[PDB]
Design a protein around this ligand. Structure first.
Ligand SMILES: [Cs+]
Ligand SMILES: [Cs+]
Ligand SMILES: [Cs+]
Ligand SMILES: [Cs+]
Ligand SMILES: [Cs+]
Ligand SMILES: [Cs+]
Ligand SMILES: [Cs+]
Ligand SMILES: [Cs+]
Ligand SMILES: [Cs+]
Ligand SMILES: [Cs+]
Ligand SMILES: [Cs+]
Ligand SMILES: [Cs+]
Ligand SMILES: [Cs+]
Ligand SMILES: [Cs+]
Lengths: 369, 369, 369
């Protein structure tokens, strides 16, 4: 059965503030394929908090969602709170009509999504709120559906659920293309130097917090760009070295300028999860920030590190770029070599973390940079 | 009406600990000038938490504060909790005599200020506690007063209200004066190089958390110094580059030493908000910390970055300094040029964040550095 | 008397989540030697939270623990919650039989320790849980015992009790031994250069959070290694400079490679407090991470800085190492000098902070690096 832990609105408002205004599944509530048929969808036992209301699923099958008539549609399996309903106290013992497990389309879910609307809202308070758990694609009549967990709505970062690391990676090596401007691939694939003449695309360890960011879905941007899912002040840390950096040989060392920048772009709307409307940034918002700017120093390998705080908005693209001159005999930080003999990033890594919010006055005051 | 949400002392102690022992206005409670007259002061509806007690202002005018007889005095408009009073339950419905909106002078507010005293204190528990909302300067009889919001007591940094960013800025460029020791202007105005021969004072984007820090009010120190409002272990991050750095030309490169330091000074008492007594640091406390120390390397532009954790105390001045030699032909990191042709900081930025507390044993153990 | 604040299991689960699942003493509850005899152990008044249950000790002696028959044994003084017991409501006023102050051996404490087991556990829920306060060594009959506070179970880092700084130090100088690989001493003693020919072991200011880390007890590793007490994603920040770094003199500058790495090692089991079993890391976990890798640049002093996030596991050794070549005429970053004339780390400091957890899926996804 779908049970309420503390189902009242005042205590919910207090627990929501204690959860840092984040809602989500605390434990279990995953799909049970062994108990799922063509007319029912089974979900395992678990606990969830939705805008300060504790929801519990009580053993096989733990709970069953009626899927009769559902076919040839992609739907969202949602956990919903409806305060217009009444919890029946039969047996002085509670049915919980204020809690539902249902199927919704994307526009309906967006209109009542906890991330964008609230039961405790000041300007537009709601009586109905929902949390999406899975994308469920119902096939032809008589089949079992396919599904895709909505990881952003599952808490498992726990002590500071709305903040913390958004993305991080292990050290990696990446060949620098012979161009003026290029992105640094932050999404798990680098063009690794492997021999004196060649580099090859190689996976490296990377992790993203789906509540805070996701990989860009576009072919041109998937290796390099993150989509920011939550507004905030973020901290970006980078560290690494430039190996086989170019310079003019003493004939004094002729250094070559380069910079590593972080960048944001909000030109494309609806990149956030569910195609949600982006949050428009304040007038005069930054788009490019120098993290490291200097000249090559005449050494085989030169280290760098930088830490900055930056504002990012729901729907933004975030990326890192390496910039230098294109004349290898005069102004380029890169040389004419390939593989390990060519200029490359070595032991490069980054962490992106959400460290502050942009609510109230901070939007205009802290949000422009 | 002034309403209490959960007005009992045990649940208040729990909510206060959940608020990270911070009190303040959560929403609204700003001045309503359209409903303010010569005999009344109007305040808009809102919610506030004072040492774990929820206070609510319930529509125009939402609440009215009697200002009869108030003239030719600067006062503090405060929200107060008096546990000696009794909440009248008339109409089995509550008046809330334990909550007041009143005018206090600075010494009285300091004697019962939530930041320095508590209703739940172990050594000296109080029955009366207050939160200042505005400075109100009452003019001559028959006029409306002037006012200045006390932003430190307004929450709008929310998930970690007692911690988070204290100050941060965007990248800026700043000309290095031809002196051995100088402060780096961290308060929003830099001496920006603008031509081959000149620099000009230019604003850059900066933000301060008024709960954690404020700009020094003294003319000599206003461009450079912060006043720390809250004790703690802070993290200072800096990044930038030294452009047109001086060095002896090969005739080998003759590098020139420089350092960037952060500094604290507590010589001046009562710099904290309301002229509150500073918190004296432990014996042997640090005053100067090297963030970057090295020689110029022979390049046009040389990048740096540093991250340190440091103890800071309520009432302290905090600042950053650039130090180098003064003989340009031998030991100075600066040259004999002006504007963009002179040594300057380029793409310089910083973040100061409160990351830990100095309560209990940590005062002596972690507070000296 | 031993009093319960809110002694019900649902509200305990909520307060435990608000405490970031940390249990411990909030105030007092220290040993009272003036009221301690050969048959009784006195403890001072205080407040503690154990898995969301508030425990209070109510004035001299505040509480007395019977020590009759205790002799010639090292025991653990523990505060225990037993939900199998019943709180007697005599005098319509509560005795609190569900709370005990007792002596336990290490295996019994480990079997019911709050850090490893829970009253609210999903897979193995418990009815008995304990928090160790002191090691108590009872001597020969008729004597008073010796004791050692268990600081990890005392909260006094308060707003984010499960996270925050694990270890930090002030700037220090350390002579680089003429070897290929060496650890950097992070535990409070450095080999400080003091003259043109000598260095001497000198204390520097350091602080550790006993909940998160401790000094390695082994002679060979005590100057250099931390023992991690809590799993998590940690942030390591380092900054400093390499002074009197070696290089081949122009006859072009012949730079010399060096790196500073952080390292983890879990070969030795039971290093965690009480000899608790280490938490085994995921398959393919990192052991060495480059923080700074570059060549010496021809300057007297060269600065560096690095920030990385890394996974660490309960029971791990954590340390920092400096690596370079051993041929001073060709590949070593160190020279042939001693004291201030020899290559050394200058103004070196670090902070290690716990920034994320490794619960659920994050163990496999974020835990390998
Ligand atoms: Cs709470
Ligand atoms: Cs069906
Ligand atoms: Cs259908
Ligand atoms: Cs699936
Ligand atoms: Cs996406
Ligand atoms: Cs008046
Ligand atoms: Cs007056
Ligand atoms: Cs005003
Ligand atoms: Cs000030
Ligand atoms: Cs940092
Ligand atoms: Cs005895
Ligand atoms: Cs015994
Ligand atoms: Cs002792
Ligand atoms: Cs130890």
């Amino acid at each position: 059965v779908l049970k309420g832990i503390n189902f009242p609105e005042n205590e919910a408002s207090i627990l929501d503030l204690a959860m840092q205004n984040r809602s989500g599944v605390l434990d279990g509530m995953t799909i049970d394929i062994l108990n799922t048929t063509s007319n029912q969808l089974a979900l395992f036992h678990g606990t969830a908090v939705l805008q300060g209301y504790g929801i519990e699923i009580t053993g096989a099958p733990d709970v069953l969602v009626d899927t009769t008539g559902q076919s040839n549609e992609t739907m969202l399996l949602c956990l919903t709170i409806d305060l217009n309903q009444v919890n029946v106290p039969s047996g002085t013992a509670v049915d919980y009509k204020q809690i539902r497990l249902e199927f919704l389309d994307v526009p309906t879910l967006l209109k009542q999504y906890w991330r964008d609307h609230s039961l405790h809202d000041l300007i537009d308070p709601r009586r109905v709120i929902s949390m999406p758990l899975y994308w469920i694609t119902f096939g032809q009549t008589g089949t079992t559906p396919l599904y895709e967990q909505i990881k952003s709505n599952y808490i498992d970062n726990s002590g500071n659920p709305a903040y913390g690391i958004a993305a991080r990676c292990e050290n990696f090596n990446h060949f620098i293309n012979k161009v003026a401007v290029q992105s640094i691939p932050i999404n798990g694939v680098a063009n690794r130097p492997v021999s004196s003449t060649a580099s090859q695309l190689t996976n490296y360890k990377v992790w993203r917090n789906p509540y805070l960011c996701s990989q860009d879905p576009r072919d041109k941007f998937a290796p390099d760009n993150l989509v920011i899912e939550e507004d905030g002040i973020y901290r970006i840390d980078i560290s690494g070295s430039i190996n086989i950096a170019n310079y003019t040989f003493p004939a004094r060392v002729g250094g070559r300028y380069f910079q590593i920048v972080c960048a944001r772009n909000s030109s494309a709307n609806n990149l956030a999860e569910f195609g949600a409307e982006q949050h428009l940034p304040p007038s005069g918002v930054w788009t490019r920030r120098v993290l490291v700017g200097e000249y090559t120093a005449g050494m085989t390998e030169q280290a760098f590190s930088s830490v900055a705080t930056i504002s990012l908005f729901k729907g933004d693209n975030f990326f890192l770029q390496f910039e230098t001159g294109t004349n290898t005999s005069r102004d380029s930080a890169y040389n004419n070599g390939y593989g390990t003999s060519g200029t490359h990033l070595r032991n490069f890594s980054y962490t992106l973390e959400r460290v502050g919010d942009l609510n109230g006055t901070a939007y205009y005051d802290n949000g422009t940079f």
